[PDB]
Amino acid sequence: HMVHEATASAPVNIACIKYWGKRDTRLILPTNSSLSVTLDQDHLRSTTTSRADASFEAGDRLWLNGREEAIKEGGRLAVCIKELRAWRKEMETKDKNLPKLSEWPLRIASYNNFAGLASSASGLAALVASLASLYSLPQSPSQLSLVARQGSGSACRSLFGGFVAWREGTDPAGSDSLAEEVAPREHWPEMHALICVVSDAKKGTSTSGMQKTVETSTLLQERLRVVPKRMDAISQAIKARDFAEFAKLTMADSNSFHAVCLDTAPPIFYLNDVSRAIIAVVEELNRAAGEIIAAYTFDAGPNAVIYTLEKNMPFVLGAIKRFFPTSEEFESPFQTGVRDLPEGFNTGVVREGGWEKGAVKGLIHTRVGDGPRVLEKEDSLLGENGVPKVLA
Amino acid sequence: MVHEATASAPVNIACIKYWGKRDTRLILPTNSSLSVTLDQDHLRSTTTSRADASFEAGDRLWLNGREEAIKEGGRLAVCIKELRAWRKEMETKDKNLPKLSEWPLRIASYNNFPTAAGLASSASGLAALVASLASLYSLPQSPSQLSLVARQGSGSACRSLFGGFVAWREGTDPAGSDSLAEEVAPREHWPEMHALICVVSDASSTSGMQKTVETSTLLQERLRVVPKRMDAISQAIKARDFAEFAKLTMADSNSFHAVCLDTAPPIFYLNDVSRAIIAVVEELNRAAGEIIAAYTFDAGPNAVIYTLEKNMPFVLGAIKRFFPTSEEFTGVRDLPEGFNTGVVREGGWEKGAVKGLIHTRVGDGPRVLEKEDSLLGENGVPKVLA
Numbered sequence: 220h221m222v223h224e225a226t227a228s229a230p231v232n233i234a235c236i237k238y239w240g241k242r243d244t245r246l247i248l249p250t251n252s253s254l255s256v257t258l259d260q261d262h263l264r265s266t267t268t269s270r271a272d273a274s275f276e277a278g279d280r281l282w283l284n285g286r287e288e289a290i291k292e293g294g295r296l297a298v299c300i301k302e303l304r305a306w307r308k309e310m311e312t313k314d315k316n317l318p319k320l321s322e323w324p325l326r327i328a329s330y331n332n333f334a335g336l337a338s339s340a341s342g343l344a345a346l347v348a349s350l351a352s353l354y355s356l357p358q359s360p361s362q363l364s365l366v367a368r369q370g371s372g373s374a375c376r377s378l379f380g381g382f383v384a385w386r387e388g389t390d391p392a393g394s395d396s397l398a399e400e401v402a403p404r405e406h407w408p409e410m411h412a413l414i415c416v417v418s419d420a421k422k423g424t425s426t427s428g429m430q431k432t433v434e435t436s437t438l439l440q441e442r443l444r445v446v447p448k449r450m451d452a453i454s455q456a457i458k459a460r461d462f463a464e465f466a467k468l469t470m471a472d473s474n475s476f477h478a479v480c481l482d483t484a485p486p487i488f489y490l491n492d493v494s495r496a497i498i499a500v501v502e503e504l505n506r507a508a509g510e511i512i513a514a515y516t517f518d519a520g521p522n523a524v525i526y527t528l529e530k531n532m533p534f535v536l537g538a539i540k541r542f543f544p545t546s547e548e549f550e551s552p553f554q555t556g557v558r559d560l561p562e563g564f565n566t567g568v569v570r571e572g573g574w575e576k577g578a579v580k581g582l583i584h585t586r587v588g589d590g591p592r593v594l595e596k597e598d599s600l601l602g603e604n605g606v607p608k609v610l611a
Numbered sequence: 612m613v614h615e616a617t618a619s620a621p622v623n624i625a626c627i628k629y630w631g632k633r634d635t636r637l638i639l640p641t642n643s644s645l646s647v648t649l650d651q652d653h654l655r656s657t658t659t660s661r662a663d664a665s666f667e668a669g670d671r672l673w674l675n676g677r678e679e680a681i682k683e684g685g686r687l688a689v690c691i692k693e694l695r696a697w698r699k700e701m702e703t704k705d706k707n708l709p710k711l712s713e714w715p716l717r718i719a720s721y722n723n724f725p726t727a728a729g730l731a732s733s734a735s736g737l738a739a740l741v742a743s744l745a746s747l748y749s750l751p752q753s754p755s756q757l758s759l760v761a762r763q764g765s766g767s768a769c770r771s772l773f774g775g776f777v778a779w780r781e782g783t784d785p786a787g788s789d790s791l792a793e794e795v796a797p798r799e800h801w802p803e804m805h806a807l808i809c810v811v812s813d814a815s816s817t818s819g820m821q822k823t824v825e826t827s828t829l830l831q832e833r834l835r836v837v838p839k840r841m842d843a844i845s846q847a848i849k850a851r852d853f854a855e856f857a858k859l860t861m862a863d864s865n866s867f868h869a870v871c872l873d874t875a876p877p878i879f880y881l882n883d884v885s886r887a888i889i890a891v892v893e894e895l896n897r898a899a900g901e902i903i904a905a906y907t908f909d910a911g912p913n914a915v916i917y918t919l920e921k922n923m924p925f926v927l928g929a930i931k932r933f934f935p936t937s938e939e940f941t942g943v944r945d946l947p948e949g950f951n952t953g954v955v956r957e958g959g960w961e962k963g964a965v966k967g968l969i970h971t972r973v974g975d976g977p978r979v980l981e982k983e984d985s986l987l988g989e990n991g992v993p994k995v996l997a
């Protein structure tokens with residue numbers, strides 16, 4: 220009984236130039252280009268096993284984190300599977316001797332090792348990489364990113380390692396809305412990142428959200444004029460390894476994104492009081508250093524990502540650890556240490572009384588990473604009958 | 612013959628926000644703004660001015676019982692100089708008048724704001740100084756003309772020279788002659804307009820706003836949008852259309868805080884309690900089936916919630932349901948049916964997260980007061996000293 224199965228992981232990525240707004244909601248074509256750093260799969264990843272077998276019971280089945288997920292026709296997962304099956308069928312049409320993998324049911328199981336960390340970009344990228352390997356697709360990562368983009372917009376940027384653009388494109392059919400390497404991981408491997416996972420228990424109760432910004436935010440129209448300039452500038456900065464300009468652009472575009480969220484009617488809020496305190500600390504770190512050594516950025520929630528070159532991570536750790544005692548124990552994967560605040564650091568930028576333990580829940584030290592990884596049989600999430608090994 | 616005048620001036624709250632100066636010396640703004648003047652029965656700044664030929668040379672001023680320096684070329688000094696010059700014009704035309712302009716000034720001011728409210732006081736404070744000196748000197752100048760002096764001395768002070776609904780017109784004259792306040796509608800036009808100030812627990816405007824001017828790209832689009840909001844909100848006020856007034860007020864408040872966020876470094880005034888109040892007001896409007904309340908936020912986390920007098924019980928009820936207030940600081944209605952309490956953290960907020968509530972309403976312009984209201988003793992020193 221021959222087994223046709225592939226397992227792949229894909230990385231998380233954190234946008235420096237933010238995706239926020241679609242011009243086509245079905246194809247997921249964006250209102251502007253975006254640009255991200257791919258993070259190290261040694262620390263954060265999604266992993267997906269896909270198997271096709273002529274003897275599986277009819278109908279595809281998919282599990283996420285051990286719970287079966289319905290694959291409704293037309294939805295994000297179904298569309299991705301349909302496009303990748305079509306590319307496999309094309310191979311079979313050209314070479315009639317190939318086994319007819321495209322005709323068989325799929326069994327798919329995925330897990331991430333993650334807090335409020337956005338899991339859809341790495342998750343859909345892992346699905347695409349896994350199925351592309353299962354089907355031995357000839358398509359390039361760029362071509363595969365067209366499919367990932369339709370599962371979840373920022374998933375397309377997780378098809379590459381290093382520093383990665385999503386080019387907005389101008390084709391109404393989306394053929395040029397895809398990811399592109401701006402610089403590979405080996406160009407600037409010292410780019411590290413500290414993720415600050417923030418408690419968010421004082422609020423009430425993104426795809427629906429960002430379209431409300433498109434519909435109602437007057438300030439968004441100026442953001443769309445500014446983003447191309449930041450794309451060009453941050454690409455130059457990465458190519459030049461100019462950390463200060465990379466950092467300035469990253470902080471400016473993060474704040475720009477949260478600004479147009481605030482300008483939405485009704486307003487959209489993601490930063491919380493802890494997020495703002497982390498910004499104050501990073502801003503004061505750069506000021507006291509007399510040099511921009513760290514850059515915060517925030518996606519659609521209060522967690523901070525702080526970019527810094529490895530050599531300056533002890534300053535970032537020192538500042539965060541000084542003001543934000545964590546409930547989770549912290550070990551750097553590299554045993555990176557902690558340095559005292561630069562002389563002149565104004566501790567008054569943090570509230571009187573400080574922050575209670577757990578206001579920041581925990582820290583994750585990671586760095587710029589490679590693209591998706593095809594794994595070995597040993598890593599499979601599926602048992603011998605095609606049902607996941609772990610069911611929640 | 613004692614020459615002494617006491618006047619009060621109101622606080623005002625901008626619906627269309629002033630944020631950004633095109634001229635920092637004359638205080639000319641990057642855009643027009645528009646506010647509601649609040650009732651001096653509730654919040655007021657009060658200033659007594661006296662001129663006397665036998666005072667010791669040099670003007671003196673006290674604020675809340677503490678003496679304040681009036682250095683030449685400073686804001687207060689230039690304000691006094693301009694008003695003195697208008698008085699000297701009177702004495703030139705009428706040689707019989709006493710030479711009040713030639714005599715030293717003793718000035719005392721006080722505001723009645725609640726302890727720890729976080730309310731900005733410089734605007735009503737300078738408006739009261741201007742009204743008091745104009746009364747002392749018997750100046751003929753109109754409120755509009757006086758607002759030029761208030762504007763130069765303290766910006767949005769110019770909008771407190773009028774009651775009701777007041778515009779600060781940005782003007783185009785580089786010397787500022789047309790950057791002044793103008794009445795959009797008097798208090799009597801819409802006296803039903805009430806306001807609930809929510810004093811929020813909070814763990815620099817002048818320098819701050821110029822950083823936004825220097826660094827915010829989104830500000831440049833805000834400056835294109837504000838004239839549209841000014842026209843629309845003036846029409847809504849004239850039509851007494853609360854829902855349109857409310858939408859514009861909430862939109863421009865959020866626009867202001869957005870360009871603060873887009874400043875480099877970013878400026879943050881709203882906090883998590885501010886955000887919760889916004890969630891409650893928006894859900895109140897939804898559950899009520901019509902817009903009955905409008906939040907707005909200035910340079911800090913305090914909320915001001917506009918509402919017609921008849922709907923204040925709903926607004927007060929919703930705020931007191933989720934934000935129990937402090938001891939250190941009225942009929943209420945239950946939440947409308949269908950209000951989703953999920954828009955607030957479970958169980959609401961701790962007591963004192965909102966410290967207290969001030970219920971006020973649209974009010975008239977500055978008031979000239981009586982001898983009994985004087986802040987000065989017989990010798991021209993304040994009655995109450997710190």
Ligand SMILES: Nc1ncnc2[nH]cnc12
Nearest residue numbers: 265329330338339342343
């Ligand atoms: N790991 C994953 N695989 C597929 N879809 C996902 N959506 C979120 N995470 C996912």
Ligand SMILES: Nc1ncnc2[nH]cnc12
Nearest residue numbers: 656720721732733736737
């Ligand atoms: N009442 C007042 N008088 C003068 N200047 C002030 N600044 C703030 N409040 C004031």
